[PDB]
Amino acid sequence: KNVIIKWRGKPIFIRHRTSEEIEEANEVNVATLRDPQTDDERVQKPEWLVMIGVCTHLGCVPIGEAGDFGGWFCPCHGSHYDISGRIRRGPAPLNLEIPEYDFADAETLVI
Amino acid sequence: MTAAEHGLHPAEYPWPQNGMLSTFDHASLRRGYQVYKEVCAACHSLDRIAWRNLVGVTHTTDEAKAFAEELEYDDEPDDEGNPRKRPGKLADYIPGPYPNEQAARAANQGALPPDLSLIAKARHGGADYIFALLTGYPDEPPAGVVLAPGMNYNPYFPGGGIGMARTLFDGVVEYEDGTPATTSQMAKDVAAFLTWAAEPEHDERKKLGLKAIIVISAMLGLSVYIKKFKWSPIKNRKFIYNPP
Amino acid sequence: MTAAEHGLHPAEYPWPQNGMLSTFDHASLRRGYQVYKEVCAACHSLDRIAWRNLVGVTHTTDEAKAFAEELEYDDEPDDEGNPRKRPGKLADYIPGPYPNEQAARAANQGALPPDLSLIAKARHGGADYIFALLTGYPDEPPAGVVLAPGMNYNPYFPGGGIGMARTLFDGVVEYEDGTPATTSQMAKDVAAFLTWAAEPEHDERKKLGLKAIIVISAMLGLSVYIKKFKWSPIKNRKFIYNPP
Amino acid sequence: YMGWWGHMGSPPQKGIAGYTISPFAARPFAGVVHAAIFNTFRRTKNQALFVILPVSFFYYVWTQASEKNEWLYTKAGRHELAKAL
Amino acid sequence: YMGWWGHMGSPPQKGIAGYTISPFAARPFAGVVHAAIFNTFRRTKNQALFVILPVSFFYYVWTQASEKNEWLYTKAGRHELAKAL
Amino acid sequence: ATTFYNVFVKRNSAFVATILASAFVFDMTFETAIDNFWDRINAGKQWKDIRHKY
Amino acid sequence: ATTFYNVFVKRNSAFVATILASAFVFDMTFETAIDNFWDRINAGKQWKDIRHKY
Amino acid sequence: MALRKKNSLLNMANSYVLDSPQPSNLNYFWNFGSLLALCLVIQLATGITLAMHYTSHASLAFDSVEHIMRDVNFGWFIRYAHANTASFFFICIYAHMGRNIYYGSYKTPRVLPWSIGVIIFLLLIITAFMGYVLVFGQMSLWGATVICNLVSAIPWLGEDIVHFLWGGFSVGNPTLQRFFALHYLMPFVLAVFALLHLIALHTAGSSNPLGITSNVDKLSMHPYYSFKDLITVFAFLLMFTLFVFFSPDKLGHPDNYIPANPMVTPASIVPEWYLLPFYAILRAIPDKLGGVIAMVAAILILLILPIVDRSIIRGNAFKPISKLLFGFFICNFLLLGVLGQVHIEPPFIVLGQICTIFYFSYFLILLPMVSTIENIFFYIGSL
């Protein structure tokens, strides 16, 4: 599941990723990526994808679970983000930004 | 960048208001309002324009009051503090189609149709861009363009894929003045109207500028005579030197 | 003016916070919050105070979050642009009993109960006035006073007739700290609380003032020594005059 | 009407010798207790009337006026107030 | 390094006679047409190189750069652009 | 010419008075003249030209 | 005394340095001293005094 | 003695604007000083007027500017006058600086007015940048974001300083309110420094286009330069009129008519035209800190002209090689301006680096070399 928390006006996507989702994200060779990053650079905890859910193209919010890389699909100009929230297809130049987030408890994060 | 990424630059069309001494054609402004009201207003707001702004530009006071009075606006609460509506007055702003951004985006496959009150100033190109965009949807996208779902190809829009579909077709409006409502005619009228909305001082500004040009030019000419006159003793000075 | 028209002036009570070096009694502040919450908040708002303001003054962070989370506040609209509520956060302001003035007046026979966030600063008298007013409703109005309908006699209120009835009676609150909740005790606590609400910097302000007094006093003493020292050649100057 | 150092606009000075000592050689608070008591007493005594007379007069005026005003707005002062308006 | 009228800081002047006529006695626009044409031509001709050389050079640079940039972002310029990045 | 000089120009009080009165007249007439010219070059375009239909 | 003068006072660079270092120390110690005094004269009144109940 | 000289107050006016002794041969480029005074006055008048209608709160700022354009009588004029005069202020200031560099106004004995002048130029940049933010359109926001994140390059404390200037963790309401207060204030500081550089200049007086002393031949500031200043005032007002009344948006950027949106980033964040050369210099250096230092150094390096110009002769009127070098310097400064608004793409990346090297090498290499050689040519050539 993926949550949407507003934080400084920007939406925050929080997805509780499954084991197989993590695996799917760890596949794509960094080389072939507009914005080259691995999931380990993105998440500090593999079960908590926390991103700023503004599309990097113009600034719509991607609809999650949709896409072609089964992550996030911006409906505005059709840009597809990954399970890491990396840009794969469409006009968007960058991957979905990561906020400064810390696990205060293992059950609560502060953003 | 690729030309595609920039968008095709719109032609320079000869608008009536182009020209240092030229006002808007107010009959075109009126027709443009009718296009806005019957086509654009479905999705786009015009939030910076009040009913009073149409008066003596496109409509008489009576016509504008009629338009305002057809709508309901939020009144001050009644005596039990319950909410109330009132009919609109000339001081009211023209109300938008959606209650908030979220409702707007939900109705437009995620895209938010911008408010059109400043759009003629807020895009490179101005009226020419609006005219080019509304008239520039090709029947078929150039072979090889992959449009995202819910996008329409339009070369004037940067990137090529715009969330707004073609909306002007011959006879979507029936003009009250008998003008044939062709796609081009409606785009010209609505582009004129939106340009007026962005810069409603335009006609007055250019008349005052004409007065300023004339006076300032005369003052410039006279200032040159006066300078030459006062300076002539210095410019005409002669010396005779006898070494001591 | 007659004394009646002015209102009786309240006594000077010895508040804990009176005194250049004295803070509020925070246990009284906490008890006063409980009186506000259980008695005044029925009619009076406290709109300038947020839940976070109680933290480390009267309540721990947990207690204040608990209070906030029990309430519903307006959220941003959902994705279809429909309105939504959320539970309260510490950043939220304490919500009022009425949606608008009209609703407030309708519930109070025309009178509008003021917001209490600044009332201790907004009346001559401050805490003493609040204390005097709440405790100063006589059983019977002085013989010959004609009260307007819906008015109550209270000599501290200018004119004598106040729209707020007596509200504090022995045991309307049950204090959580076992303090006997007498009319006087509750008035003292709530008056302390409201004074804090009006001036929450009070404790810090007076401590910084103590530091400033000490430093500025020392600098004043030293400045006098230095002045006398530098001036002594002028003050000690002597002359001998021999007429030429 | 004022010059500057060297040409201040003094009439010519001649015949005055001026003497003074260094701040470090002097006691800055020499005779301070005598001054604080006796000098301040002399200077205050000499100026006292110029403060006391106007202050006492205007205070008396105010006192009389404020007491009358207070009395006019009592029950006892009803009649006198009616005439005053 | 500058004084004021009367003591401006000129070396002593002697032997120069200066003459001029009143603004009301003179034609302010005397020989204006000759000056506007021949004098402006002389003064412009003498300064032309100092404007023409730098302007023409920097315009050429810009023209070459802008044309290359345009060409790199065409289809034809795909390969050259790939190398340039 | 001497007469004109003596009356309107010689005294600065008179000269300034003449300048200000001329400024008043210029201001009023120039306003009117520009108004009419502007209306002629923008004929049939302004609201005043179409108002009559409504 | 001469020693003290020669080291800390004679050179203005040293004097200003001594004044600033003293200001630093005063600032830090005075803060602490006032804090403790304020807490003693307002004992049982402050949040820190009642916090333990919660 | 005449009252204008006797009375202390009148005498100060007199010494600056009436009996001030001027060289008799100043050309039209000595008129930019008074135009800059006129721009400063127009900006104070229009500025104070807009402040009577503007609201500094971020929820209302953009709308208050629309209210000015739409509802306030002549509001459109006051707004466009203020916005366009800011561009004219920089045209006149670049001209005035150009005049000073070409004619050697920075040489002894005028180093002090020059050095104060360099600070006036910095204050003008800051003033104009803050004013740009007050609209709170897209260029306003994205300008404040980008420019205040340059401060992040200051080591150790940079991030902290940014958050302190913004008054929070992003550009928002606190930022806008503080820029309003500072934008109001800065023009007054700027006016004081303008007055200081004039008082400093009064000791030497104006230089003149021949570079020789004028002590031999002076003219009162009034009436000669009063009436000559009127010609350029009317020429300026003609240009002002053409922009303000006929093309009020020609110098500006459409993106500032879109309300600030922290989510949507504009297509291109480019500064106002007059800042573009400094922006190109910053882009040239790949390092963040390096770029910031270079950009500041591009202004502060003007302070060393008094040292690096080794000529025995003041100004360029008689120095053919120096005139050529100055031509190339000025054109390169314009090319930098143009490169400030192109995309960061080939081949403009390397070109911008070359132009940046040329900019600095004028002060550090060429001007010292050329001025040394011209000294020797004048001496040998006239033997």
Ligand code: HEC
């Ligand atoms: C039923 C929907 C709809 C109608 C009808 C419509 N629009 Fe739009 N319009 C949009 C949407 C959605 C966008 C945003 C497109 C995007 O950002 O991809 C838009 C964008 C625009 C833009 C700005 C494009 C840009 O550069 O950002 C202009 C101008 C515009 N519309 C004008 C009009 C005019 C004029 C009319 C009719 C006379 C009109 N629209 C009719 C939905 C509509």
Ligand code: HEC
């Ligand atoms: C059910 C109604 C009600 C309750 C309970 C109530 N008030 Fe009020 N209060 C009012 C109304 C109504 C007024 C305005 C009266 C007027 O202006 O005539 C008022 C006025 C006041 C005033 C201002 C008097 C002035 O000078 O204007 C203060 C202070 C005050 N209340 C404090 C309190 C405190 C403290 C409590 C309880 C601890 C309290 N109130 C309880 C209704 C109430």
Ligand code: HEM
């Ligand atoms: C050197 C003097 C000044 C300069 C260079 C300057 C420059 C600017 C600029 C560039 C803008 C942005 C204009 C826009 O695009 O809309 C602006 C806006 C503004 N300035 Fe100034 N300004 C100056 C003096 C002042 C002063 C003294 C005030 C007094 C308050 C002021 C008040 C404003 C206000 C309120 C705005 C915002 C409204 C608007 O954008 O028009 N300015 N200024």
Ligand code: HEM
């Ligand atoms: C508000 C901005 C400014 C104003 C109003 C202003 C005004 C003036 C005026 C009126 C003069 C005397 C007349 C003239 O020579 O034009 C002058 C001279 C001068 N200014 Fe400025 N100035 C400003 C900014 C600057 C700047 C930015 C510099 C330098 C970077 C500068 C450096 C000088 C110098 C060196 C002179 C003496 C030049 C000479 O006469 O030889 N000024 N200024």
Ligand SMILES: CCCCCCCCCCCCO[C@@H]1O[C@H](CO)[C@@H](O[C@H]2O[C@H](CO)[C@@H](O)[C@H](O)[C@H]2O)[C@H](O)[C@H]1O
């Ligand atoms: C520019 C706007 C107009 C207002 C004036 C500008 C304010 C700046 C004035 C404050 C600085 C004081 O200005 C200073 O005063 C005195 C007299 O006034 C001048 O003194 C000068 O003129 C007087 C007589 O006119 C002579 O006695 C003197 O020999 C000469 O140097 C200084 O050269 C000037 O530097």
Ligand code: FES
């Ligand atoms: S806005 Fe996200 S796809 Fe264009």
